[PDB]
Amino acid sequence: QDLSEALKEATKEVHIRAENSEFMRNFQKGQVSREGFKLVMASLYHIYTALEEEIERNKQNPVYAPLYFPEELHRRAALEQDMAFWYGPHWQEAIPYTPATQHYVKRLHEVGGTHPELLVAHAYTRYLGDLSGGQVLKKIAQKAMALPSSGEGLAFFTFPSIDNPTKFKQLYRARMNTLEMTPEVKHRVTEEAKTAFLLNIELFEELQALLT
Numbered sequence: 001q002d003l004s005e006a007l008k009e010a011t012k013e014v015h016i017r018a019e020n021s022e023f024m025r026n027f028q029k030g031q032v033s034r035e036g037f038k039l040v041m042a043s044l045y046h047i048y049t050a051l052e053e054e055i056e057r058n059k060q061n062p063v064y065a066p067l068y069f070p071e072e073l074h075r076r077a078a079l080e081q082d083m084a085f086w087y088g089p090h091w092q093e094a095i096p097y098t099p100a101t102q103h104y105v106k107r108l109h110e111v112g113g114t115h116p117e118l119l120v121a122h123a124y125t126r127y128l129g130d131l132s133g134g135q136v137l138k139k140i141a142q143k144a145m146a147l148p149s150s151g152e153g154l155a156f157f158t159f160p161s162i163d164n165p166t167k168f169k170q171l172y173r174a175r176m177n178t179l180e181m182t183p184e185v186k187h188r189v190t191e192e193a194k195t196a197f198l199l200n201i202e203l204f205e206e207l208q209a210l211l212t
């Protein structure tokens with residue numbers, strides 16, 4: 001069984017749960033506020049900053065290297081534009097750093113520093129979702145908040161070096177399936193993908209509480 005299929009199948013139940021967190025349910029319905037949207041985007045800024053520091057640390061490591069696509073996929077620079085948009089020119093001092101975000105970041109550096117063979121789990125959970133459902137979420141955010149089609153405020157959701165998110169996804173999956181893989185590694189990659197999903201759920205649970 002191919003890793004990209006093993007992952008999708010191992011995470012479908014928790015994906016359904018993540019979609020049905022209160023925050024994402026509200027989001028899906030068009031009810032996101034500016035405050036709530038800013039909180040989630042500032043959190044992703046920290047998350048992707050950590051993920052991408054660790055992708056760089058491990059770019060030459062064969063347990064990750066086939067998924068090294070910084071130009072196409074990396075989100076940090078995009079999130080920086082979005083922070084300047086939502087929080088202003090001194091965004092670096094304004095943006096929050098919530099404990100649930102700190103928890104996700106911590107685990108990202110553990111994986112990247114000490115278990116890099118699991119990094120694929122974390123890149124899968126974030127990037128493949130961003131290339132799929134993230135596109136749906138973009139439209140909803142756009143309509144809810146009157147964000148222009150020219151893309152300001154939603155750089156995160158825009159992939160200017162990928163023509164077609166579905167074709168890229170297929171490439172990325174085909175490259176996932178070329179990673180060296182024993183049952184040990186595969187079994188733990190899929191466990192870690194489930195933890196990645198949980199760290200996202202816990203962020204959303206925390207954000208919802210902060211907002212209400």
Ligand code: HEM
Pocket residue numbers: 004007008015018019020024025027028124125126127128129130132133134136137196197200201
């Ligand atoms: C309301 C919230 C969300 C909606 C509406 C949503 C929607 C979707 C849709 C429609 C797909 C494609 C289904 C398919 O190809 O068969 C998908 C794929 C994906 N989503 Fe989500 N999603 C949501 C939240 C999440 C969250 C919180 C994560 C992860 C943190 C996530 C991660 C993924 C991943 C990794 C994939 C790719 C699955 C695969 O092809 O292996 N999504 N999303």
